[PDB]
Amino acid sequence: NTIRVFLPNSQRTVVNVRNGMSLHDCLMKALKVRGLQPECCAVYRLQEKKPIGWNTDAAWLIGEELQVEFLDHVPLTTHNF
Numbered sequence: 001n002t003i004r005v006f007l008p009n010s011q012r013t014v015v016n017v018r019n020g021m022s023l024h025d026c027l028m029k030a031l032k033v034r035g036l037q038p039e040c041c042a043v044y045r046l047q048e049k050k051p052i053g054w055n056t057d058a059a060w061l062i063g064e065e066l067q068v069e070f071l072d073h074v075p076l077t078t079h080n081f
């Protein structure tokens with residue numbers, strides 16, 4: 001049960017989905033092997049780009065195309081403690 005995921009810089013990957021798996025868990029490895037972390041990105045369902053969260057249950061998205069974008073490079077609030 002595969003989902004098509006478009007990535008930044010014209011890249012693209014297919015990921016496998018099991019029931020209950022979150023989007024984060026479904027995409028973690030496919031992003032890691034391309035040098036990307038979900039925490040640095042936003043994800044969308046193509047339907048237009050509709051934003052969805054990283055805790056979306058990916059089983060409901062089988063059959064759709066998703067898109068991953070980098071978050072804009074703006075400073076984060078300090079969290080060192």
Ligand SMILES: *[C@@H](c1ccc(OCC(N)=O)c(OC)c1)[C@H]1C(=O)c2ccccc2N1C(C)=O
Nearest residue numbers: 037038039040041070071072073074075076077
């Ligand atoms: C990726 C990363 C990039 C940008 C982030 O947020 C930008 C924003 N204002 O929302 C982000 O949030 C977690 C992550 C990578 C970084 O480039 C980076 C900078 C600072 C802190 C953490 C990170 N990054 C992570 C989480 O790997």
